Design an enzyme around this catalytic site. Structure first.
Site, PDB file in Angstrom:
ATOM      1  CG  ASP A 173     109.186  -6.441  77.311  1.00  0.00           C
ATOM      2  OD1 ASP A 173     109.324  -7.229  78.268  1.00  0.00           O
ATOM      3  OD2 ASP A 173     108.380  -5.487  77.308  1.00  0.00           O
ATOM      4  N   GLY A 227     107.232  -6.422  85.322  1.00  0.00           N
ATOM      5  CA  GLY A 227     106.039  -7.260  85.141  1.00  0.00           C
ATOM      6  C   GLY A 227     105.858  -7.781  83.718  1.00  0.00           C
ATOM      7  CB  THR A 228     107.526  -6.667  80.598  1.00  0.00           C
ATOM      8  OG1 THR A 228     108.892  -6.933  80.758  1.00  0.00           O
ATOM      9  CG2 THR A 228     107.268  -5.221  81.022  1.00  0.00           C
ATOM     10  CB  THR A 229     106.185 -11.129  77.933  1.00  0.00           C
ATOM     11  OG1 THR A 229     106.285 -12.489  77.625  1.00  0.00           O
ATOM     12  CG2 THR A 229     106.785 -10.386  76.755  1.00  0.00           C
TER      13      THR A 229
END
Lengths: 244, 186, 90, 212, 239, 246, 249
Positions: free
Chosen positions: D45, D28-30
């Site tokens: 990331d 779910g990270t950028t």
């Protein structure tokens, strides 16, 4: 008659598919010679037009086909087999442009069409078409281009390919020009000089002068393949006649 | 028959380990590659049948046994096939490259995302008690006997200390040319 | 029903996409084009029986424009007398 | 054939009747993109994927589905590059990825930012799981996308060089920070290889038996 | 074209049987404690890769092996079908496939290719070998017709008749696997078209029990192991 | 329904396949050699006209990044097998195991495609023999020949086409078990220099190797795990430089 | 339809000289198979060709094949075909019970077998089976012995004794003299003795070549071993010596 060997696409003791060798004699049923050449930024196709009967409309006799925006072909062989193969080539370019999001290369259409000819060249219930297909475009990857395809399903690139029952004289004059000039294209910056050069070679090879209605022309630049009308051909015949 | 249960996996200097709950091992082998599966017992046994089949056919077709990393790609691509209705499992592959000698451990979600931790791996419900114990007890580059010691004390400590009469653990310690299965009871 | 939303769509996808293509070729090129394309596929399907091989056919991938494309259906696939008496009628 | 629904109804009774269905892992990270001078940077990331040497992606949503589609389309792109004898275009991969995501109706939960160099130039696109598409000089997906887009807009200018694109990429990622948690980046530049940069920022009773 | 000759006999099966009658010789022998398979391989090519892992002899599962006379292209289609059936039986029953069930399975597929006129038959003869608890060590043969038979010793392919006569006079019901090693090597040296037998012309294998009570082991011999049974037996093409 | 092709002739022969080996025997020669650290496959390009651009007619083909192929026989039959062979490598093996298949598993699958064309009504067998060459971590370097029958063979060296018996005699005379890849290239260039129908230079000759990994040709850096293509197709300048060392 | 009947010389229609006639030729070349009913049993018997010295007897298939707990099939003609024909009948019978809560009737096991054989005659360049069969047994909840013959054309018939294969004329001639349809063999022993006498006239050497299966009501199927048929052969040969020495001259 040797039974099935001569009548279906199956190997003779020698290893000859008589269905394919005979389909190469069908391509000369038109008695038409066609010529194709590459310029610097264009590729050009010139084709002998036969209209013996007074009763024909010369606007409906054409062996040159627009395959998409950028690609076009001349066909050597019977018109029923040239219109069938043109309709396939139109459909194959359309589905490639949808699937891969860019315009179908001439190399890819010649391979795709040649793979279809390999079916009829192996399946006993399928006969090879009686036509030779001569694709031309200005590909962004290979600039001006010429690709020829035949009833056996063998295709290869070219810089001045030609098909007809007098093709050997045209080809032998082309080989002698490319031997002396040593560049693999004719160095004209505009397509008018390329077409005029291509009508000077077909006059010199076929031993006859041409009227504006006894000649055909094709002009493949970037962004457009298109066919010339008889008055655009007569502008070139007038410029040939102004030079000599 | 007991659904769930835990598997733990760990690396040492030229060696691997796979602890598991007894009281029917979760841990199968296919030549030198070991597979600990937690989760629904029917899926653990159906996957054993399925990987036994696939890996016997591999050994027959390819004239050599399936390596730990190849078996990782096979288990993930097989598990992914079951995308709309997956295997209710946590597989933990292990094994020592037979041509390199490097320790390998990997584990997966029910559709085959590959973890490849270089230290240790956990699977089963209530993993995060053991994840803390295993992170507390682990150190890099152990000998096989200390590697057995750290994984066995992790299993014992994170064990339900109220029901230790119902206990039993299998620890496979896997080396280059040798495998020892220790059963372990209290 | 309890049955996955996508199931009936993906079951019939190969048939549906060719049936939809043949109707576009009928519309844009006339009845001759799908009559040609269905008879080529009939010769290829009907003259290519071998009870021990089920892995498609080389010319059918040329005809279908599938000669350089993989689906999940090609990486994840799924009696000789029973095949014989289906091919000939019982 | 393909992805099956064998235990779809079997697992519709297991969850109903109190087995916890295992968690599908999600990234779910950028994730970000940079159509920088004469190329295109992308970053996240394990999370950056290749469709071919010159075309790469960052994935969000289900981790297995971002890998699975990028590897399926990478196969079709490799086969098409062998079939056509030409380097695979980013618009061709975008068409395949987007057309494949549509066949699966967003039940394949891959959200993807696609970038690369090809004989036409340098391109950047992003596909959502229902098979619908964006284009721009800079794009971002995942939970930090508001903050990342504020930083991307605040500093992008034409003729951004490699180093400046890599700074903006890394600052739009670090503006997503306050699984994952340090930068991987790949840089596609029109004459050159894709530069990939990892991490840019007596106790018990024993019995025993020998086994093979 | 799968039509009967007026005697009630199948021309295609007879022509497939003519084809395998050229196709290199294979012997199998069933000792009291193991099975031996051996096959003679016409290596007329220097540049063909000897020390390739198989040509005539193959594993079907962990306790079953075959020898092939006939077309290797045809044999490999049947061999894969048998391997799939062996693992599909093991998956279903959790138990290793009985040899009779698998040998006759390949005899039912090979009969079908003889009945339908679109199919040519398979030009292959198999000398199967294996162990199971239902019978013990079993030796079977199967041929292009789909006929199969149980034997104590048998040859297939070229020079069958000379080989059967040599087997018949030296075979004993109580012999050990090392006596069957000797016998199969002697028989092939007494049957060969080539001047003398050697380790690359020979494919070999055994189905013994070993020392450990649960074991049955199928050593398909590598060339160096075949050189040892050659020099022990007195065939001994040795320095 | 009296329907099959390639039925048995009374002497125990398949007939149609025999005629298919006469088509192979008429093609421009191709050959292959296995060395201690690499492999070579080679052929001549025969022009239908000197106006043809034989940068378009590749005869030596990449099947996977560690496997190459070449033919003798009918080139159309070879364009269609090569694209099925590529599809097979990806769909059967790469998409299950995340690694490419060996050169024994891909040769079996190509041969299975050619066997199915012998045992059919409606279809003639292929008019091509294929040489397939490659590398794998556990088998090492390998070379195989596949014929219209679907029979495949592992070879140390081989040749197929018109010049094949004189090529195979030269390959027996020159092959030894300690060749290296620069040596095998010289032997292959020598063998085509005898079999050549037309002119001999870097433009008429096709030559590929499976050798060491080339990390330059992977086209992206950062992943040492990925070693980079073993298969490399010799550039026309390298062929002319080696043809200056001849 | 054959021989000397010929109008204005002759010419052939679509007709007699045909694939099914050549399948009948294959059946006649296969070993002798016999069956006889009794008062309350049926015995099927076969000729083994005399086994080769290196053949393995303990795994050699029993020639008479059980299709179900109450039905037995034997054949002459092609073995491979009979194996494919017994498989279809066995699964057909097991499927019968699974869908009809009823074991297969002997007459339905004969109409099915001959029925599938007829479909491989009808068309398609798929050949008919080179096989003829005896199908014998009992129906459930009955004590009547049944015995049917089927032929490659798919014709079938019921017999109280019959023989198929090699030399079957001489056997059918012996059965017509020794089998009385009013008073059939009243006991299993006499039924077996009649089949051993019947086969002893046509078999290659003796007790090696005969093998028999006895079917009785209520699924009592029973193969006789070599040792049991050796005591029948010996008893019959004793009675030959007794009959010869009981010559009066």
């Amino acid at each position: 008659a040797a039974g099935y060997d001569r009548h279906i696409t199956i190997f003779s003791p020698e290893g000859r598919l008589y269905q394919v060798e005979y389909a190469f004699k069908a391509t000369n049923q038109t008695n038409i010679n066609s010529l194709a050449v590459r310029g610097k930024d264009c590729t050009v196709v010139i084709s002998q037009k036969k209209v013996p009967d007074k009763l024909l409309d010369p606007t409906t006799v054409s062996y040159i086909f627009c395959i998409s925006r950028t690609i076009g072909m001349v066909v050597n062989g019977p018109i029923p087999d040239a219109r069938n193969a043109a309709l396939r080539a139109k459909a194959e370019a359309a589905e490639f442009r949808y699937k891969y999001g860019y315009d179908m290369p001439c190399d890819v259409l010649a391979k795709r069409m040649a793979n279809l000819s390999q079916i009829y060249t192996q399946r006993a219930y399928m006969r090879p078409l009686g036509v030779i297909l001569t694709f031309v475009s200005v590909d962004e990857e290979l600039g001006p281009s010429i690709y020829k395809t035949d009833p056996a399903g063998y295709y290869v690139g070219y810089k001045a390919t030609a098909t007809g029952p007098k093709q050997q004289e045209i080809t032998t004059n082309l080989e002698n020009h490319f031997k002396k000039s040593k560049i693999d294209h004719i160095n004209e910056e505009s397509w008018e000089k390329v077409v005029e050069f291509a009508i000077t070679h077909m006059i010199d090879a076929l031993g006859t002068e041409f009227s504006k209605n006894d000649l055909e022309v094709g002009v493949a630049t970037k962004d457009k393949f298109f066919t010339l009308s008889a008055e655009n051909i007569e502008e070139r015949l007038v410029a040939i006649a102004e030079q000599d | 028959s007991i659904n769930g249960g835990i598997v733990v996996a760990m690396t040492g200097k030229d060696c691997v380990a796979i602890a598991c709950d007894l009281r029917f091992e979760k841990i199968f082998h296919y030549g030198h590659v070991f597979l600990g599966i937690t989760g629904l017992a029917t899926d653990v046994t159906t996957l054993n049948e399925m990987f036994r089949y696939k890996t016997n056919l591999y050994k027959l077709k390819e004239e050599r046994a399936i390596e730990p990393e190849t078996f990782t790609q096979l288990v993930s691509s097989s598990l992914y096939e079951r995308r709309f209705g997956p295997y209710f499992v946590g597989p933990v592959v292990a094994g020592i490259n037979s041509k390199s000698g490097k320790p390998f451990i990997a584990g997966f979600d029910l559709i085959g995302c590959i973890d490849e931790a270089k230290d240790f791996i956990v699977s089963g419900t209530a993993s995060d008690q053991l994840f803390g114990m295993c992170e507390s007890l682990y150190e890099p580059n152990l000998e096989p006997e200390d590697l057995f010691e750290t994984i066995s004390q992790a299993l014992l400590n994170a064990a339900d200390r109220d029901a230790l009469s119902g206990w039993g653990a299998v620890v496979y310690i896997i080396k280059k040319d040798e495998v020892v299965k220790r059963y372990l009871k209290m | 029903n309890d049955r996955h939303p996508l199931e009936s769509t993906l079951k019939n996808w190969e048939t549906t996409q060719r049936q939809r293509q043949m109707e576009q070729y009928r519309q844009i090129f006339g009845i001759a084009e799908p009559m040609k394309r269905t008879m080529e596929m009939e010769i290829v399907n009907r003259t290519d029986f071998n009870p021990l091989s089920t892995n498609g056919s080389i010319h059918r991938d040329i005809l279908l424009n599938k000669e350089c494309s993989i689906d999940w259906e090609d990486v994840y696939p799924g009696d000789v007398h029973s095949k014989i008496e289906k091919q000939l009628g019982i | 054939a393909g992805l099956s629904f064998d235990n779809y109804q079997r697992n519709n009774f297991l969850a109903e009747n109190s087995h916890t269905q295992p968690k599908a892992t999600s990234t779910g990270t950028t994730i970000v993109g940079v159509k920088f001078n004469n190329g295109v940077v992308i970053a996240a990331d394990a999370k950056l994927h290749r469709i071919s040497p010159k075309i790469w992606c960052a994935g969000a949503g289900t981790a297995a589905d971002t890998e699975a589609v990028t590897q399926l389309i990478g196969s079709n792109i490799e086969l098409h590059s062998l079939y056509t004898s030409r380097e695979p275009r980013v618009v061709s991969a975008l068409q395949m990825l987007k057309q494949h995501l549509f066949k699966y109706q967003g039940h394949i939960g891959a959200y993807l930012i696609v970038a690369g160099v090809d004989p036409t130039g340098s391109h950047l696109f992003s596909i959502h799981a229902h098979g619908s598409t964006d284009v721009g000089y800079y794009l971002s997906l995942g939970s930090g996308s508001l903050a990342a887009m504020a930083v991307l807009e605040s500093h992008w200018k034409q003729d951004l060089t490699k180093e400046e694109a890599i700074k903006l990429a890394s600052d739009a990622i670090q503006a997503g920070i306050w699984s994952g948690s340090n930068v991987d980046v790949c840089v596609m530049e029109i004459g050159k290889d894709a530069e990939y940069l990892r991490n840019y920022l007596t106790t018990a009773v024993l019995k025993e038996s020998i086994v093979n | 074209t799968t039509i009967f000759s007026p005697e009630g006999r199948l021309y295609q099966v007879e022509y497939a049987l003519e084809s395998i009658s050229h196709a290199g010789t294979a012997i199998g022998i069933m000792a009291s404690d193991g099975i031996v398979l051996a096959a003679e391989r016409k290596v007329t090519s220097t540049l063909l890769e000897q020390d390739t892992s198989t040509e005539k002899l193959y594993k079907l599962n962990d306790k079953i092996a075959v020898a092939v006379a006939g077309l290797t292209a045809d044999a490999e289609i049947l061999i894969n079908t048998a391997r799939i059936h062996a693992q599909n039986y093991l998956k279903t029953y959790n138990e290793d496939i009985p040899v009779e069930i698998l040998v006759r399975r390949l005899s039912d597929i090979k009969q079908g290719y003889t009945q339908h006129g679109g199919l040519r038959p398979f030009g292959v003869s198999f000398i199967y070998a294996g162990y199971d608890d239902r019978y013990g060590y079993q030796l079977y043969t199967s041929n292009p017709s789909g006929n199969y038979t149980g034997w104590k010793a048998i040859s297939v392919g070229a020079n069958t008749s000379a080989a059967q006569t040599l087997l018949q006079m030296d075979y004993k019901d109580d012999m050990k696997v090392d006596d069957a090693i000797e016998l199969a090597l002697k028989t092939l040296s007494k049957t060969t078209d080539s001047s003398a037998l050697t380790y690359d012309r020979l494919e070999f294998a055994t189905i013994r029990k070993g020392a450990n009570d649960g074991e049955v082991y199928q050593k398909i011999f590598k060339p160096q192991e075949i050189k040892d049974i050659l020099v022990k037996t007195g065939i001994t093409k040795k320095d | 329904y009296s329907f099959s092709l390639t039925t048995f002739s009374p002497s125990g022969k398949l007939g149609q396949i025999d005629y298919a080996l006469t088509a192979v025997k008429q093609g421009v020669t191709s050959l292959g050699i296995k060395a201690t650290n690499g492999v070579v496959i080679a052929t001549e390009k025969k022009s239908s006209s000197p106006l043809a651009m034989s940068e378009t007619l590749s005869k030596v083909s990449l099947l996977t990044p560690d496997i190459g192929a070449v033919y003798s026989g009918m080139g159309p039959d070879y364009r269609v097998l090569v694209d099925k062979s590529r599809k097979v490598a990806h769909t059967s093996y790469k998409r299950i195991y995340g690694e490419y298949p060996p050169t024994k598993l891909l040769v079996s699958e190509v041969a299975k495609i050619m066997q199915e064309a012998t045992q059919s009504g409606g279809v003639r067998p292929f008019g091509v023999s294929l040489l397939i060459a490659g590398h794998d971590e556990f088998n090492g370097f390998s070379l195989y020949q596949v014929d219209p029958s679907g029979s495949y063979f592992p070879w140390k060296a081989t040749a197929i086409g018109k010049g094949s018996v004189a090529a195979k005699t030269f390959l027996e005379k020159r092959w030894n078990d300690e060749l290296e890849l620069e040596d095998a290239i010289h032997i292959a260039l020598l063998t085509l220099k005898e079999s050549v129908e037309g002119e001999f230079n870097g433009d008429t000759i096709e030559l590929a190797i499976i050798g060491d990994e080339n990390p330059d040709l992977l086209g992206y850096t950062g992943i040492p795990t990925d070693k980079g293509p073993r298969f490399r197709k010799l550039t026309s300048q390298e062929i002319n430089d080696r043809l200056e060392a001849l | 339809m054959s021989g000397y009947d010929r109008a204005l010389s002759i010419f052939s229609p679509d007709g007699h000289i045909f694939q099914v006639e050549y399948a009948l030729e294959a059946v006649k070349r296969g070993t002798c198979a016999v069956g006889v009913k009794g008062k309350n049993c049926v015995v099927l018997g076969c000729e083994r060709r005399s086994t080769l010295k290196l053949q393995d007897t303990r795994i050699t298939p029993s020639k008479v094949s059980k299709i179900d707990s109450h039905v037995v099939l034997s054949f002459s003609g092609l073995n491979a075909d009979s194996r494919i024909l017994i498989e279809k009948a066995r699964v057909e019978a097991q499927s019968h019970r699974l869908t009809l809560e009823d074991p297969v009737t002997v007459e339905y096991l004969t109409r099915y077998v001959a029925g599938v054989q007829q479909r491989y005659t009808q068309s398609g360049g798929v050949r008919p089976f080179g096989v003829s069969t005896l199908i014998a047994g009992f129906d459930p909840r009955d004590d009547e012995p049944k015995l049917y013959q089927t032929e490659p054309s798919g014709i079938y018939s019921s017999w109280s004794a019959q023989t198929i294969g090699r030399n079957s004329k001489t056997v059918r001639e012996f059965l017509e003299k020794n089998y009385d349809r009013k008073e059939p063999p009243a006991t299993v022993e006499e039924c077996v003795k009649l089949t051993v006498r019947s086969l002893l006239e046509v078999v290659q050497t003796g007790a090696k070549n005969i093998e028999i299966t006895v079917v009785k009501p209520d699924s009592d199927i029973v193969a006789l071993s070599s040792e049991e048929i050796n005591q029948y052969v010996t008893q019959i040969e004793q009675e030959k010596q007794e009959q010869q020495e009981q010559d009066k001259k």
